[PDB]
Amino acid sequence: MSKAFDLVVIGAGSGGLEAGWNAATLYGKRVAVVDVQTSHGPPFYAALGGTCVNVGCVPKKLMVTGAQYMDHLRESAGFGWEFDGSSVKANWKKLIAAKNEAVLDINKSYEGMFNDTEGLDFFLGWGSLESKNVVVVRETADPKSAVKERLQADHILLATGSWPQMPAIPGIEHCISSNEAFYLPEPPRRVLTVGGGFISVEFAGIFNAYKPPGGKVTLCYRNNLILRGFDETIREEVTKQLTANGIEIMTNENPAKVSLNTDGSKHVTFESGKTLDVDVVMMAIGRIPRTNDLQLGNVGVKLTPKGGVQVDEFSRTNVPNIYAIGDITDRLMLTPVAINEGAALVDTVFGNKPRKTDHTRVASAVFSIPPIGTCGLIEEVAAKEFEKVAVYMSSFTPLMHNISGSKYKKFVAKIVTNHSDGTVLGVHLLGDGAPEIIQAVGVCLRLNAKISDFYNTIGVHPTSAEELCSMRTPSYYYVKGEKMEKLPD
Amino acid sequence: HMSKAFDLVVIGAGSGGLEAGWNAATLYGKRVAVVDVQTSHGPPFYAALGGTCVNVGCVPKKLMVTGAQYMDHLRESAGFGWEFDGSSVKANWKKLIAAKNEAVLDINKSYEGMFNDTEGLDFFLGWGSLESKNVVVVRETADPKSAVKERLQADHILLATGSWPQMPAIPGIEHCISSNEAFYLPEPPRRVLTVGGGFISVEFAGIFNAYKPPGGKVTLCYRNNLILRGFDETIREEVTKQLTANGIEIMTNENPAKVSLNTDGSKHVTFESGKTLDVDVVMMAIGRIPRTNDLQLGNVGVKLTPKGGVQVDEFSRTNVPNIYAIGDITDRLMLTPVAINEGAALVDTVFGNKPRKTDHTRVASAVFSIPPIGTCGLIEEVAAKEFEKVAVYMSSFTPLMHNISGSKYKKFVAKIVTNHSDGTVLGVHLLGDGAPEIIQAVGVCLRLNAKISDFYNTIGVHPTSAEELCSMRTPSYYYVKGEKMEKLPD
Numbered sequence: 001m002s003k004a005f006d007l008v009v010i011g012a013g014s015g016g017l018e019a020g021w022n023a024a025t026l027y028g029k030r031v032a033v034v035d036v037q038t039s040h041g042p043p044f045y046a047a048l049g050g051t052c053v054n055v056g057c058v059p060k061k062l063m064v065t066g067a068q069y070m071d072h073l074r075e076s077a078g079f080g081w082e083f084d085g086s087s088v089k090a091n092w093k094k095l096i097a098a099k100n101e102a103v104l105d106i107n108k109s110y111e112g113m114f115n116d117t118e119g120l121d122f123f124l125g126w127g128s129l130e131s132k133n134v135v136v137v138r139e140t141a142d143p144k145s146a147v148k149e150r151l152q153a154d155h156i157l158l159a160t161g162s163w164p165q166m167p168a169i170p171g172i173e174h175c176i177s178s179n180e181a182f183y184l185p186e187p188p189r190r191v192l193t194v195g196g197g198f199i200s201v202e203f204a205g206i207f208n209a210y211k212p213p214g215g216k217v218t219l220c221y222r223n224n225l226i227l228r229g230f231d232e233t234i235r236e237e238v239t240k241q242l243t244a245n246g247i248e249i250m251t252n253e254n255p256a257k258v259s260l261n262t263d264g265s266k267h268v269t270f271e272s273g274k275t276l277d278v279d280v281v282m283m284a285i286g287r288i289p290r291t292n293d294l295q296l297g298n299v300g301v302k303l304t305p306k307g308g309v310q311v312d313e314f315s316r317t318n319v320p321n322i323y324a325i326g327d328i329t330d331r332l333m334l335t336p337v338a339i340n341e342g343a344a345l346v347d348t349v350f351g352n353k354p355r356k357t358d359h360t361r362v363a364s365a366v367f368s369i370p371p372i373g374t375c376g377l378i379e380e381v382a383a384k385e386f387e388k389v390a391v392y393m394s395s396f397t398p399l400m401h402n403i404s405g406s407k408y409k410k411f412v413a414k415i416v417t418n419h420s421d422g423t424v425l426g427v428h429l430l431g432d433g434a435p436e437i438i439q440a441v442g443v444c445l446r447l448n449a450k451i452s453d454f455y456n457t458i459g460v461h462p463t464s465a466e467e468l469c470s471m472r473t474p475s476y477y478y479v480k481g482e483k484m485e486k487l488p489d
Numbered sequence: 490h491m492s493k494a495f496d497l498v499v500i501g502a503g504s505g506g507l508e509a510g511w512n513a514a515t516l517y518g519k520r521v522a523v524v525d526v527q528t529s530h531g532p533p534f535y536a537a538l539g540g541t542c543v544n545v546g547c548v549p550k551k552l553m554v555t556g557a558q559y560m561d562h563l564r565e566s567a568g569f570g571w572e573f574d575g576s577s578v579k580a581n582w583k584k585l586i587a588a589k590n591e592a593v594l595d596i597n598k599s600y601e602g603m604f605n606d607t608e609g610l611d612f613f614l615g616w617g618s619l620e621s622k623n624v625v626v627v628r629e630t631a632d633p634k635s636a637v638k639e640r641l642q643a644d645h646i647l648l649a650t651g652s653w654p655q656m657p658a659i660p661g662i663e664h665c666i667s668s669n670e671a672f673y674l675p676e677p678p679r680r681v682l683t684v685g686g687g688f689i690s691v692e693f694a695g696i697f698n699a700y701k702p703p704g705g706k707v708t709l710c711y712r713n714n715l716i717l718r719g720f721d722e723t724i725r726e727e728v729t730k731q732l733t734a735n736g737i738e739i740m741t742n743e744n745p746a747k748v749s750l751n752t753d754g755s756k757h758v759t760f761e762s763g764k765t766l767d768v769d770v771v772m773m774a775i776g777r778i779p780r781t782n783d784l785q786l787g788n789v790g791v792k793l794t795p796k797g798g799v800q801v802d803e804f805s806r807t808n809v810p811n812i813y814a815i816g817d818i819t820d821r822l823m824l825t826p827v828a829i830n831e832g833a834a835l836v837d838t839v840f841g842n843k844p845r846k847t848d849h850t851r852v853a854s855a856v857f858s859i860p861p862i863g864t865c866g867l868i869e870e871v872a873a874k875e876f877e878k879v880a881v882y883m884s885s886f887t888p889l890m891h892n893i894s895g896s897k898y899k900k901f902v903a904k905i906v907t908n909h910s911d912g913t914v915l916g917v918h919l920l921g922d923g924a925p926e927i928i929q930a931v932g933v934c935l936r937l938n939a940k941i942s943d944f945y946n947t948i949g950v951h952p953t954s955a956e957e958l959c960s961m962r963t964p965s966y967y968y969v970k971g972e973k974m975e976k977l978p979d
């Protein structure tokens with residue numbers, strides 16, 4: 001049993017490492033951090049640096065960047081670029097290779113951060129909860145496996161992230177998740193992405209760009225319109241723009257069973273009885289908090305009906321000295337949120353300056369082609385919470401997208417306001433640059449910006465962003481939940 | 490030989506003129522005359538219905554800088570495993586200009602349509618000048634002794650004739666061009682000199698650099714030590730390195746003295762230093778001068794500034810009561826969205842009796858250099874003079890993608906200048922892909938008197954270059970009563 005660690009962190013993720021690093025370097029505390037690999041990839045995929053670094057945001061972005069060149073190569077003809085169209089080949093093996101040494105470089109720098117940091121000490125293997133003051137690192141997820149060491153802990157931080165949700169259906173063994181998608185040896189000629197969420201749409205675009213000749217990408221979603229939770233205009237518009245770039249959307253369709261065909265390909269039967277033959281089925285239907293391997297049964301840490309570690313506003317479990325941040329808490333499954341929770345916790349605990357994460361008006365993005373950037377309430381959620389809601393809406397084709405021959409690439413800008421004071425509740429953007437435009441909109445909503453603060457700021461011309469400063473008249477309203485073009489006199 | 494009286498007569502169908510005219514007409518139901526010298530872009534007068542921005546400014550340059558970005562995209566795509574015949578790549582300048590001219594022409598025609606479809610908003614081809622304090626005469630040419638097309642009776646008059654390229658009086662200036670002629674070159678120049686350290690010189694340097702024929706070269710000269718005077722100094726130094734890196738030669742402390750034609754029609758250039766250079770095109774972009782000469786302001790006695798701009802107060806008023814000036818002719822901030830805001834403020838002042846004035850501080854602006862610039866508010870040097878203690882937050886990083894791409898030089902820079910007393914953000918300066926789009930909403934933050942703490946307490950979007958603005962909590966260095974230092978004195 002090790003000497004007294006001030007903090008023990010199970011999960012070297014976006015949250016864990018912020019908490020660890022802040023606890024150690026900032027408040028001079030003695031810290032232990034525990035993950036299952038020191039580098040990305042099979043068998044466990046996530047590793048030192050967390051889901052983001054190894055099998056999330058970082059490698060994804062690189063791969064969506066890769067996929068954009070399909071569009072750039074085609075669009076450049078309008079601007080009078082000329083090359084041998086038959087000679088164009090998308091080399092998936094070189095992408096993955098580059099993506100792996102990029103991620104691998106991050107892995108090794110974290111290792112160096114641990115090596116160079118006093119009182120911040122890394123431990124390979126599977127952490128679980130023995131007692132309220134003891135974390136046991138075993139060799140595997142199996143609790144009956146060899147004990148690598150027991151860590152004595154003043155306080156304990158659960159930060160094991162989340163994991164792909166696979167539906168219990170016949171042939172689920174033949175289907176994959178984002179995790180495996182990151183390491184496919186060759187790019188799939190045909191692929192089914194299952195889900196209407198961000199991971200399905202993003203991978204649909206990546207496969208769509210790198211697919212060998214006569215390839216095809218289908219995406220299915222059990223309900224009527226993809227990207228539930230996002231602005232409805234944008235949901236309908238990013239459907240049309242994925243379709244336009246050669247992706248088939250099957251809505252109101254869900255796999256019932258997958259079976260292997262005699263060539264090793266995958267035959268898929270939808271609950272509708274429809275069938276489809278594809279080389280890969282990627283499940284991205286949700287992500288579940290990663291609680292199973294922690295043996296929270298031992299110390300009686302309460303999970304929510306959902307399955308996440310229940311916490312209050314300060315990341316505290318029902319066991320006083322034990323805490324949970326990140327995707328394990330099953331709230332906003334973002335990297336910057338897990339990092340904010342991490343820092344607020346460590347300042348709460350070791351700074352006795354109790355700070356909590358604001359989970360409202362958080363800026364987020366979907367690296368679809370074309371991409372999304374959003375911050376705050378959709379109009380539907382606003383319409384229920386506020387008596388009178390104004391919606392400002394503007395759609396336009398960036399002038400370049402005339403010439404480029406991608407005329408479908410409409411840019412959409414929506415501002416949702418509390419019409420009583422013109423306070424901006426939400427800002428929803430679809431088109432090139434959206435993820436970059438929305439960051440500073442995040443700070444505007446933090447300052448309780450009103451619609452008049454947007455339209456009285458002078459535009460930067462020519463940009464898509466200036467559309468946000470060009471909308472003075474509501475397009476329509478929601479009065480006590482009910483839609484209309486005008487307010488009633 | 491006179492008209493029925495107009496509420497407003499607008500000389501210049503520009504960004505500013507059309508906003509004023511359109512707002513006056515459709516909003517306050519006024520009767521409006523607008524005067525410009527062409528109905529479409531191009532020679533002979535280049536600017537036209539829609540103004541400099543539409544015809545020979547922001548709109549066509551953006552389309553062209555977009556075009557030049559494919560040189561980079563084609564090369565960078567190799568790192569993400571794209572493969573094609575590198576020898577087969579040709580940049581076709583004729584198709585760029587052609588597509589650009591189709592796009593600008595479609596704007597020209599829709600303004601014509603706007604005038605056709607709008608009651609009490611009437612367009613008039615030709616050269617407007619000031620006859621009396623209540624009369625604008627439209628002549629057939631800039632020559633005041635030319636045929637009169639009509640006299641417009643005017644309650645109020647709006648001067649909005651924009652600006653025009655400054656050419657230095659040197660021998661061989663006749664052999665040199667401006668941005669105006671650059672927009673119509675029949676072929677792309679193998680060798681070109683851009684003269685000027687400002688935004689037009691840099692932007693065109695990048696365009697010529699992407700579309701130059703084989704063995705071609707782009708040189709940019711600037712009479713002083715460091716290009717882009719007025720911009721953040723770190724960014725000035727960093728965009729010098731990034732233009733160099735992409736194969737553009739910067740000659741600083743160098744200015745043309747004379748140009749002469751060589752026997753093959755090429756252009757032989759002598760610098761004040763005695764240095765010489767042979768290039769196919771010399772593009773002068775050394776400044777832009779308010780367009781006042783053709784208005785005959787001598788007639789009604791409208792006061793120009795020492796600079797040469799129409800002098801105005803905060804409400805766009807000349808010294809002649811019912812005569813106003815907005816836009817580049819007022820020789821202040823020479824941006825389209827600023828002429829548009831002045832235009833709207835003037836019309837609401839005049840025909841709404843709700844006196845409004847443009848805020849010329851904390852205006853967001855951009856440079857569509859490769860890579861680009863987005864800035865809003867004070868540079869640390871101007872801040873250091875105005876404020877007793879100034880903090881500077883600074884971050885430089887290579888977007889991860891620019892390891893893999895092989896464009897490792899493409900450093901992204903972020904600088905926040907604060908009033909250290911209250912942490913009030915005075916200015917935000919950005920270099921790298923997306924900067925012109927990041928800075929827009931920063932504009933609104935500065936409008937709301939954001940503090941550095943409002944930035945670093947906003948949760949980043951990941952992964953983006955924009956989240957670096959929310960990742961800077963410690964000042965890098967300070968300016969105490971003008972003097973620089975790493976730390977504050979105890």
Ligand SMILES: Cc1cc2nc3c(=O)[nH]c(=O)nc-3n(C[C@H](O)[C@H](O)[C@H](O)COP(=O)(O)OP(=O)(O)OC[C@H]3O[C@@H](n4cnc5c(N)ncnc54)[C@H](O)[C@@H]3O)c2cc1C
Pocket residue numbers: 010011012013014015016034035036037044045046047048049050051052053055056057058060125126127128159160161162178199290293294325326327328332333334335336338951952
């Ligand atoms: C495909 C994909 C794309 C994404 N894109 C984005 C994006 O663009 N932007 C964004 O903000 N977020 C994105 N995310 C989500 C983001 O990565 C997560 O929100 C974040 O990684 C969760 O942080 P965390 O600290 O909760 O846990 P993680 O960072 O997930 O850390 C968990 C770590 O703990 C380890 N671990 C697990 N169990 C144990 C155990 N029993 N003992 C010890 N260690 C254990 C894991 O191996 C892992 O290394 C994406 C996720 C996915 C799957």
Ligand SMILES: Cc1cc2nc3c(=O)[nH]c(=O)nc-3n(C[C@H](O)[C@H](O)[C@H](O)COP(=O)(O)OP(=O)(O)OC[C@H]3O[C@@H](n4cnc5c(N)ncnc54)[C@H](O)[C@@H]3O)c2cc1C
Pocket residue numbers: 460461462500501502503504505506524525526527534535536537538539540541542543545546547548550615616617618649650651652668689780783784815816817818822823824825826828
């Ligand atoms: C190459 C270039 C790039 C630029 N890029 C940008 C940019 O990216 N962003 C930005 O914000 N700004 C940019 N600008 C500046 C922007 O173009 C101007 O600030 C804007 O056009 C000014 O509007 P205005 O109404 O004052 O004048 P203009 O828009 O210039 O309109 C004046 C009009 O008056 C006409 N005219 C002149 N004399 C007469 C006369 N006697 N009678 C009748 N008509 C007359 C002209 O034909 C012209 O159409 C750029 C300028 C140039 C030259």
Ligand SMILES: COc1ccc(NS(=O)(=O)c2cc(NC(=O)c3ccc([N+](=O)[O-])s3)ccc2OC)cc1
Pocket residue numbers: 396397398399400462463464465466467470542543547548596
């Ligand atoms: C100078 O040439 C123009 C002439 C007229 C106009 N007027 S307008 O088209 O009606 C208009 C446009 C915008 N925003 C866009 O122009 C862009 C976004 C992204 C772009 N870009 O391509 O990146 S351009 C905002 C408000 C607005 O008025 C309601 C604009 C420009």
Ligand SMILES: COc1ccc(NS(=O)(=O)c2cc(NC(=O)c3ccc([N+](=O)[O-])s3)ccc2OC)cc1
Pocket residue numbers: 052053057058061106335886887888889890952953954955956957960
């Ligand atoms: C999960 O992957 C991470 C790896 C390392 C870190 N930590 S860090 O390197 O110290 C760091 C990075 C950034 N911004 C960027 O990394 C980018 C912007 C645009 C990019 N781009 O490539 O799209 S990357 C901002 C602040 C900061 O620390 C204060 C974070 C996340």
